Design a protein around this nucleic acid. Structure first.
Ligand SMILES: [Mg+2]
Ligand SMILES: [Mg+2]
Ligand SMILES: [Mg+2]
Ligand SMILES: [Mg+2]
Ligand SMILES: [Mg+2]
Ligand SMILES: [Mg+2]
Ligand SMILES: [Mg+2]
Ligand SMILES: [Mg+2]
Ligand SMILES: [Mg+2]
Ligand SMILES: [Mg+2]
Ligand SMILES: [Mg+2]
Ligand SMILES: [Mg+2]
Ligand SMILES: [Mg+2]
Ligand SMILES: [Mg+2]
Ligand SMILES: [Mg+2]
Ligand SMILES: [Mg+2]
Ligand SMILES: [Mg+2]
Ligand SMILES: [Mg+2]
Lengths: 135, 85, 141
RNA sequence: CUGCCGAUAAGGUCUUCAAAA
RNA sequence: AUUGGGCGUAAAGCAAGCGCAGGCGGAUUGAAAAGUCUGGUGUUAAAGGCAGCUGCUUAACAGUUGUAUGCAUUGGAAACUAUUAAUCUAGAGUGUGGUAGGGAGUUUUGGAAUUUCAUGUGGAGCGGUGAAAUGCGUAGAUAUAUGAAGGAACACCAGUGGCGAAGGCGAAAACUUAGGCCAUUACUGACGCUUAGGCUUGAAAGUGUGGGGAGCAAAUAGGAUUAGAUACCCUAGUAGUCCACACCGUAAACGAUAGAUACUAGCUGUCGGGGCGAUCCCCUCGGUAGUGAAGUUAACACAUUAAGUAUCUCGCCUGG
């Protein structure tokens, strides 16, 4: 614009927002305050399992889940794989992501880590789904 | 190379050997056109017509169909491009 | 020398001359006139030394109260100028002051940079020779 | 020379390639 | 996007103006030296940074020497900016002399036309529509002739036009009043541009109080059309449209283009002042239009009244 104009009102940069906000909130519990500390992946507990329908092009039945994390945020996390052991009440170790078919889902469950079982009958790209090397 | 007899309404950039002259008079044009033809005929070794010549042999007539009128008129044949709505 | 038209000039003295030169070059005009000031007079003197303009004459009125400088551009036989592009650095408002270590080189020395350090306007090469810098008026190439 | 005159389920092909003759 | 972006049609020029503080700013002379440049000294801890070398089997790594950046003080330079002391008129104003306007407000005045009423003539429809029907009419309608009352708006002139910053301004007159164009051998002598905040004005609709109400018509009633019609058509019809005083402050308030300054081909119109003197036409200085090259643009297009070459200032934009 103008040197004088920018001297008065400087250039304010646009902000940046995260893609997995619920994974960066830590509740201390002794004081009950929420601070913003980034963490790659977080543990939660599921509340309601079921299926959802993709947006438009895709047509299928995708298994969702309403998991409450160690914090106090309830996030719908897709169970990435074919077959699950979730029983409405269970513990899961969510990670980052964003399934494009289901609107609102922005997290994935790390498979074969804690209570959730691995994905057997898989020999390709196993390191990601969590299956013991056939050997 | 292109030579031309510009007549005040020409872009001088396009022409190379500009020859300031008329273009509307059936006498000036013929005199100049024969002059370029006269150069060609002398180079080709045939006798000249108007160039390097005295008064009596340059004389030319004004075609049919006081002084000659080199006025540009007929402006009424330029109305506004059909528009309006 | 006599005139017929009123002579006006802009309030900002470097770009006024710069606009005159650039418009004349683009429009193929040769002789232009403007009001005369000592900063403007000095920059024109170094320009003719660098060979960008042909002549530069400063004139005064019959009363000694006004002076106007009327300069002409140096066109070649085929009518293409010697100036290619002009750009002003120390514009009004934001004045540019650069030390000697940061003295610019315009087009690897092809163009000339006008710098008025302490002894009036001065070319970039001679400014480098004296190892002294200062106000930078305009880029001419 | 001016009546009236409304609607039409979802997702979809088709350009493989100029290296060259 | 300081380096390094944009605001006509893609996001973005406030509706316009009067404008303090701020930013910028004509020419010349003198001084000082706050910015600006440069020399000397001090310091900017060590590790890290970059270059070289050594040592670990070479490397990673460790050590080693070199390597800036800024601040303060002191000594000089005087081109530009800033400060101060003064001079000049070309910027901008003032006066005299020419001069064009629907520029505004206040107070009066005028004629057609519609409606209603009064008085005659007259005798069956009028009205309305795509076609009709509500409706009006033997209580004499429509029509025709005269008169009276009242309100609203000002045909023709009227424009390939004028004025105002914008909204806007068009029957006639009086009073008050604003700005503008041209020529200046006159005068002041930079007093100028922009403007955050502030103030003023600001189409129509709407509000409050009191008047006014001819015509028209949101809301409403009825008749049509329609599958339905709370709409398009028709007949009625209140608020409102009008005036005075108080508010509201929004419009596609558009040239979708902020203001100021200097420069850049030309041609055709038209308006005003000035020069000549029948007009007509020629020249000069300005306002308002069309065409048009360099130039700009993504293209459409702009093009001396810029969206072109540049500077100053303000406002605004950052995917849906
Ligand atoms: Mg029908
Ligand atoms: Mg951009
Ligand atoms: Mg827009
Ligand atoms: Mg505007
Ligand atoms: Mg706007
Ligand atoms: Mg003003
Ligand atoms: Mg001020
Ligand atoms: Mg100056
Ligand atoms: Mg250190
Ligand atoms: Mg080390
Ligand atoms: Mg009457
Ligand atoms: Mg109103
Ligand atoms: Mg009804
Ligand atoms: Mg009616
Ligand atoms: Mg009302
Ligand atoms: Mg608005
Ligand atoms: Mg055009
Ligand atoms: Mg958003």
């Amino acid at each position: 614009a103008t040197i004088a104009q920018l001297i008065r009102k400087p250039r304010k940069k646009k902000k940046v927002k995260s893609k997995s906000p619920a994974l960066h909130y830590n509740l201390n519990l002794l004081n009950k305050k929420v601070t913003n500390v980034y963490s790659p992946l977080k543990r939660g507990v599921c509340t309601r399992v079921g299926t959802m329908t993709p947006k438009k092009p895709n047509s299928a039945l995708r298994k969702y889940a309403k998991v409450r994390l160690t914090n106090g945020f309830e996030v719908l996390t897709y169970i990435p794989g074919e077959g699950h052991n979730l029983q409405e009440h269970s513990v899961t170790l969510l990670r980052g992501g964003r399934v494009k078919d289901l609107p609102g889902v922005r997290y994935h469950i790390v498979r074969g880590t804690l209570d959730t079982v691995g994905v057997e009958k898989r020999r390709q790209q196993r390191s990601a789904y969590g299956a013991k090397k056939p050997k | 190379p292109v030579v031309a007899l510009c007549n005040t309404n020409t872009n001088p950039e396009l022409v190379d050997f500009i020859i300031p002259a008329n273009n509307h008079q059936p006498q000036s044009t013929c005199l100049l056109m024969n002059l370029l033809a006269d150069a060609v005929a002398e180079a080709k070794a045939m006798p000249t017509m108007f160039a390097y010549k005295p008064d009596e042999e340059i004389q030319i007539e004004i075609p049919q169909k006081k002084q000659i009128t080199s006025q540009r008129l007929n402006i009424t044949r330029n109305p506004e491009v059909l528009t309006r709505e | 020398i006599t005139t017929t038209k009123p002579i006006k000039a802009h309030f900002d003295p470097v770009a006024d001359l710069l606009t005159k030169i650039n418009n004349a070059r683009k429009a193929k005009l040769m002789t232009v006139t403007t009001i005369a000031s000592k900063l403007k007079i000095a920059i024109l003197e170094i320009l003719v030394k660098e060979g960008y303009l042909a002549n530069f004459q400063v004139l005064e009125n019959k009363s000694k109260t006004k002076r106007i400088v009327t300069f002409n551009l140096k066109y070649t036989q085929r009518r293409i100028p010697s100036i290619n592009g002009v750009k002003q650095i120390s514009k009004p408002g934001l004045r540019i002051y650069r030390p000697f270590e940061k003295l610019p080189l315009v087009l690897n020395g092809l163009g000339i940079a006008i710098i008025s350090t302490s002894d009036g306007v001065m070319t970039d090469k001679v400014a480098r020779l004296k190892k002294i810098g200062g106000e930078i008026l305009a880029y001419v190439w």
